[PDB]
Design a protein around this ligand. Structure first.
Ligand SMILES: *[C@@H]1O[C@H](CO)[C@@H](O)[C@H](O)[C@H]1NC(C)=O
Ligand SMILES: *[C@@H]1O[C@H](CO)[C@@H](O)[C@H](O)[C@H]1NC(C)=O
Ligand SMILES: *[C@@H]1O[C@H](CO)[C@@H](O)[C@H](O)[C@H]1NC(C)=O
Ligand SMILES: *[C@@H]1O[C@H](CO)[C@@H](O)[C@H](O)[C@H]1NC(C)=O
Ligand SMILES: *[C@@H]1O[C@H](CO)[C@@H](O)[C@H](O)[C@H]1NC(C)=O
Ligand SMILES: *[C@@H]1O[C@H](CO)[C@@H](O)[C@H](O)[C@H]1NC(C)=O
Ligand SMILES: *[C@@H]1O[C@H](CO)[C@@H](O)[C@H](O)[C@H]1NC(C)=O
Ligand SMILES: *[C@@H]1O[C@H](CO)[C@@H](O)[C@H](O)[C@H]1NC(C)=O
Ligand SMILES: *[C@@H]1O[C@H](CO)[C@@H](O)[C@H](O)[C@H]1NC(C)=O
Ligand SMILES: *[C@@H]1O[C@H](CO)[C@@H](O)[C@H](O)[C@H]1NC(C)=O
Ligand SMILES: CCCCCC
Ligand SMILES: CCCCCC
Ligand SMILES: CCCCCC
Ligand SMILES: CCCCCC
Ligand SMILES: CCCCCC
Ligand SMILES: CCCCCC
Ligand SMILES: CCCCCC
Ligand SMILES: CCCCCC
Ligand SMILES: CCCCCC
Ligand SMILES: CCCCCC
Ligand SMILES: CCCCCC
Ligand SMILES: CCCCCC
Ligand SMILES: CCCCCC
Ligand SMILES: CCCCCC
Ligand SMILES: CCCCCC
Ligand SMILES: CCCCCC
Ligand SMILES: CCCCCC
Ligand SMILES: CCCCCC
Ligand SMILES: CCCCCC
Ligand SMILES: CCCCCC
Ligand SMILES: [Cl-]
Lengths: 332, 332, 332, 332, 332
């Protein structure tokens, strides 16, 4: 039927002659994980190849595609494709290798693989946790240059399809599309790359509850020290100290879960401003206590509400509100 | 006996003609793990295939099935089946491949595999930790469409059997059953899928002890500040502050172990309401202290139990109890 | 010598006739790990098979066993055995497959494998950390029923031997023995199972130091509040609050390391009783403070050691000691 | 040249006759890791075998060794060796299997493998973190007894060489040497084992900084309560309570990182003695406060520095210093 | 075309004669990870080999290189290369083995592999986190000595090329270059090694925010105790105690993430000096309280700002600033 034993398949079709066209269709099954510290993502996809090989021609009367077991794959020539800038990947093998082989009577061949790929994606956290990130997956031939193999999307924009169940708990996925670009290696020649592009957006709610509310609550807990009688030194001092230390703990806990980036994120700006306010509260009380002591000493040697508290009760909330307005007008 | 060398098994029985019927029996051995963060499960099952192949016919006098070693499997045609929407799977191989092959004199073949499959399961945590989840395992042919291969359950509802030792420490497993549905791929044709469905329910006790009791205890520890003399400012302030901070720590610890979902869970509602109560206690004491200071200043310039404490001692417990009644009437 | 090329080894000896006897010897090399959360164990063992095959007969004059390389194994019939209710296992392969093959002149064959098996073991933690657990390893044929293959222990009780270096840092291992039982599958027939049983016991010392001493110390630290003058409210309140919060932290830390079981363990009983005592201390001080305030108000309007402290100093230690006596008489 | 096709290599040289001598040389490349909780170590080594086989003889004129590709290895007889009491091991395979084969004209064969072995090592932590541990790697034949194969060190003591780059960040490695001993299996016969022995010693500095300094600092922080005026009850009570709780946290953190051993380590002795001192400080202050209250009551009914503080200021430091002297004279 | 069946490729070209030259080109694709605790790095690279073999000569008219499938590789002789001092490595295999084979009509052969290598790198942390580290990758032949195979860089310095996307989030990568050196094994002979060298530098910002700012803030929070009236003992004591304990927690958290090195790092110097300052603050207050008590007792028996506070308010900040100036002038 196929006369496999009569041919040497160590050479591509057209060997010694013009390049062989190869078309690609991709269907994305899922996006399994995203790792900010590792700066990568894991995708499961169906990779489909189209090419023609006269050596697989067989007689028939119905002009219909016929399906073979898939162990025949290792006896015939198959296009060499690999994922560029990946960290690890594999082909699923239960209950058998998830490999399809269909051959038409005139030699047209359809080849399909189910693979899982972990690939690198460089992300900019300068607007975290309000950032928008983009990632891509690159498909390129390994052994054959553009002189031997021509790689292209089979149906252009319509070659990429996605399952309706693609979802992430933290990220919104949008704008899947495909592009084509060339690549050059100084010692091997020119290669043709295929691209799968998509965009990711975060949900802010979780970060609000984890960071922004606790810091605001710690700032507001430092303003009750302005309504307590200043004669209660052992009540007013520990309150401010505890609020400062809790703010420090919040900052450390927030920074613990992110990659060790050399630049400043928006959450760092917010937390450090809140910390500054909490610190200023303690300094303000220390000034008040010192001035009261000075006045007592002067009065005895010569023999109400302090203005600082009265003005702080107004100044601190207004400054904090203005800061919040400007911050959330800039970062939105 | 079998004349394997006289036939080409690269083509299915009936090649070029009508589709070949294939029956499936499944026996579930165990459910090994469930991962909320990964949103998958691991199952170990016995997969059994039934079909007929005249090319394996042999003479006999007893009309009995004969068992072969299993290395013969790779010399004959075997149905191509794979698990859909899986993450990883394998066939056990100790001390040999766990593969059974039995052939009847008239060509009927029984084929059995022991496999372990990790498969995806989308779960809704909107009622966590009082949620009920459902999952499924899908069996579909890879290479052959419904025109070449007809896939069905061998005995309908009786095709699925479960071992009595299937058990999870946290989940209750119930309602195993099977269904059949078709699937369509735009470039390859129609396929016939088999389904194994089951339902999972959580045990609430662990979550009660981990989250609900500590938060209630922290709320109740904030009500002892209403029975302490209000003149003890350095005793009443740190108590409320410590309770608020402990409630915050509880909220963070509860959220740490779950997937980063964009929606609200019931435990979040309970914890945030408890946090609100604890915060209000501190605000109440601050109001009491301020009013006492105002009265002292007025009396000196002109020259018991405060009503707020007296009413709070009644109001706070009743509101908390009513909230608990409504919450546990809604979520049950 | 062996005339391997002259025989088809795809059929068992006696094919079509009576069942072939197969004897098993097992020597346990080590117990590598136990996982409470995974509920499994890992064992390394030497598995030895005994059977007769006339097709391997060769002429000789000394009636002595001869050893072959082990690549011959894949050319001859070998009994099909697998481990039941396992999670994963493999055969060691350095520097070659650890497989022995010895054939006697009359056809007697000895076969030996070095394997590592991870197997499930259901454990009851209702008496943790004073529990005693039992586990078993099951050996059964996969392809052949009791009509084709008879599986038995070669020397009965003497078939199981253990290395003197089997040891676990936390568990005491005792009472290795073997049993035999039949198994039935509704669609394949009856099989004969072999069992390896052993018993595990914990060492209590580690758990004493981790849980029982800290909780008792936290309870005893709450009784120093009964010897401090009750006029020191800001000294007596934070002490009780801190002890309650530390007890809560201890409970959470203890529960963190165990599987999410739906039932109550002994350590939970001990910790919750200790927590109750610590909570009652705080309530007792609140009552004392309130009564003192009431008496002061009455005396002013009309114009030592409080009995509660005096009785608590006796009542609390005696109740705690009685609880310890009963607890350690019940759980031993 | 080698006439491989003319011989059956399923039988050892000398099959049916006297045992074949096999010499072993080992060169250690690195020690990769040590795990106290797993009680094992990982070593990378070069394993070299020497034997003679007349079936590989070839004509030559120069009496020189000739090197072959290494795919020839699987066509000839190779000694069967494995590592005893190992957990996992493998042969490196990039860019090809790291296997050397050299054959001399008279049949002498040199065989070399690069392997990585993880092996068990039982360690005694009774003097931790001042302990000295010893470990060994055992090489034994699997299939052949001492009647068929004689295993020995090729050059005795000079057979073991080590790379100068063997180093661990925490451990000092010394005293590599080799020994030989026999082993007996009740069902297979006598085997000859080869041993590689070495000694490990810890660096104390890290443990000093992690445990011993913090505990001493916490003990010294409890002695400042003896210089504060005893009238400051709310200052002296929380200090002692906080020091006790911090010591408890230190003990838990120290125990967290070690295996769950049933016996007592030296660090446990040191930490528990320090804890006892810190606890006694709190009890001492409670006694002082009670006695002051008694004296006040007696004086009123009838109508400086307390001796306990004065003696404690001397007694506590001297006892702690004596304990340190004895502890560091015993454990060195 | 190639007459593979007519030659034995178990012997290198020139077998029995002069050494065969082999050239190497390397292109680095990425640096995937660096592990301080494991002391290794992971690199993905393209390894290219050049050699001549007359046995692969074929007739042609165009003097052009022809590309073969890559399954031919296992039928011909291929140079034996491996990575020295590696921990693990593999060749990527999707969708096929990423192996290129190109043969010129005169027998010149180009061979290319895509591999991932994890290799050891000894690092000195004595200047952490201001350290600069160097690492190298070593390529050496395994089976063949310099008498049989001559290994060299194909284009010298121009043989090493790097992708523009090589980047690490924490480290700056610079100065890629190549060197050549010989290696000697006492039992096998001389080998020729190739080296790939590069330099790594850290970004200080992350460590500043994680360690240096919190410790400075904790030191500055201990200087507010010098502006509070010394009569407030219960306010001034807990402040110093809390600052000391927080500094201890910072030290432990900093040390937790690094390898257990026996020497001192710069961050340890900074943290321990800050801890000393914080401790001295508490000792200073204790001295002040004791002296005040002594003066009170003397005055009663005979019947402002203390100088220590006044001098400490100046001395502590100046000493801390001088320490910072010297530290950051030494470590830069
Ligand atoms: C298949 O090819 C035949 C001619 O060989 C043609 O008549 C028929 O229409 C074709 N069918 C399809 C579906 O292309
Ligand atoms: C899709 O393809 C069409 C036609 O080739 C092109 O105009 C369009 O820009 C493409 N869209 C994207 C997102 O690449
Ligand atoms: C097997 O087939 C024979 C006829 O070939 C029939 O007589 C016999 O009853 C059958 N046995 C079973 C169990 O079906
Ligand atoms: C089982 O099969 C019967 C008959 O086909 C059907 O009536 C019933 O609904 C099925 N049950 C389930 C759970 O699918
Ligand atoms: C081996 O068999 C021979 C007879 O073939 C007998 O004489 C001899 O005693 C036997 N030896 C053993 C050890 O069984
Ligand atoms: C061991 O075997 C003997 C005899 O078969 C039996 O009496 C005994 O009960 C067995 N012991 C165990 C532990 O099974
Ligand atoms: C090799 O053997 C020959 C004799 O066959 C001898 O003359 C020569 O000295 C030997 N060389 C070595 C290095 O042993
Ligand atoms: C090394 O070998 C020599 C001679 O065989 C022996 O005297 C010595 O004790 C050995 N050393 C060790 C450490 O085994
Ligand atoms: C190839 O070799 C031929 C001679 O065989 C020569 O004429 C031609 O210039 C060469 N081409 C290249 C590119 O080296
Ligand atoms: C590169 O090679 C040139 C010439 O061989 C040499 O002078 C130079 O030092 C080399 N550079 C490095 C970094 O090895
Ligand atoms: C998606 C925005 C949510 C804002 C909630 C306050
Ligand atoms: C908040 C600062 C107030 C200053 C009044 C003079
Ligand atoms: C917001 C409070 C203002 C008080 C001014 C006296
Ligand atoms: C299954 C419900 C248990 C409830 C315990 C209070
Ligand atoms: C004095 C009784 C207080 C109760 C608080 C729950
Ligand atoms: C008494 C009201 C205080 C409000 C502080 C936010
Ligand atoms: C709890 C609020 C009480 C208000 C009384 C006027
Ligand atoms: C529950 C306590 C109520 C007190 C009312 C005065
Ligand atoms: C094995 C029992 C030990 C008990 C130590 C108090
Ligand atoms: C003064 C002795 C107190 C004892 C508390 C356990
Ligand atoms: C501990 C309770 C004492 C009650 C005395 C009336
Ligand atoms: C154990 C102390 C008892 C005190 C009774 C007055
Ligand atoms: C190796 C001993 C070091 C001791 C440092 C105090
Ligand atoms: C005032 C000196 C106290 C010393 C405590 C270690
Ligand atoms: C430290 C104990 C002192 C006792 C004096 C009577
Ligand atoms: C070390 C201080 C001793 C004080 C004795 C009065
Ligand atoms: C690269 C140096 C940054 C310094 C920021 C204060
Ligand atoms: C850093 C302490 C400053 C205090 C000013 C009152
Ligand atoms: C900071 C030390 C001051 C000493 C004055 C006598
Ligand atoms: C920096 C404050 C100095 C005060 C000297 C009296
Ligand atoms: Cl206080």
């Amino acid at each position: 039927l196929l006369r496999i034993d009569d041919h040497d398949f160590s050479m591509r079709p057209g060997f010694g002659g013009p390049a062989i066209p190869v078309g690609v269709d991709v269907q994305v099954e899922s996006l399994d994980s995203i790792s900010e510290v590792d700066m990568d993502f894991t995708m499961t996809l169906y990779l489909r190849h189209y090419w023609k090989d006269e050596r697989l021609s067989f007689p028939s009367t119905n002009n219909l595609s016929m399906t073979f077991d898939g162990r025949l794959v290792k006896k015939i020539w198959v296009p060499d494709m690999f994922f560029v800038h990946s960290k690890r990947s594999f082909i699923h093998d239960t209950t058998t290798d998830n490999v399809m082989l269909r051959v038409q009577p005139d030699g047209k061949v359809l080849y399909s693989l189910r693979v899982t790929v972990t690939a690198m994606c460089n992300m900019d956290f300068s607007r975290f946790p309000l950032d928008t990130q983009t990632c891509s997956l690159e498909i390129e031939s390994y052994a054959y240059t553009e002189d031997d193999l021509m790689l292209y999307w089979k149906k252009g924009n319509d070659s990429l399809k996605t399952d309706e169940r693609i979802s992430l708990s933290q990220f919104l996925i949008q704008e899947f599309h495909t592009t084509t670009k060339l690549a050059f290696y100084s010692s091997t020649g020119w290669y043709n790359r295929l691209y799968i592009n998509f965009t990711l957006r975060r949900h802010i709610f979780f970060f609000l509850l984890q960071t922004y509310f606790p810091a605001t609550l710690m700032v507001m807990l430092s303003w009750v020290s302005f309504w307590i009688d200043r004669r209660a030194v052992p009540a007013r001092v520990p309150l401010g100290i505890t609020t400062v230390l809790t703010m420090s703990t919040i900052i450390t806990g927030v920074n613990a879960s992110m990659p060790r980036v050399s630049y400043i994120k928006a959450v760092d700006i917010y937390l450090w401003v809140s910390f500054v306010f909490v610190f200023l509260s303690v300094l303000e009380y220390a000034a008040v206590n010192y001035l009261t002591t000075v006045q007592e000493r002067k009065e005895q040697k010569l023999r109400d509400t302090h203005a600082i508290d009265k003005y702080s009760r107004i100044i601190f909330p207004a400054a904090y509100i203005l800061f919040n307005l400007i911050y959330w007008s800039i970062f939105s």
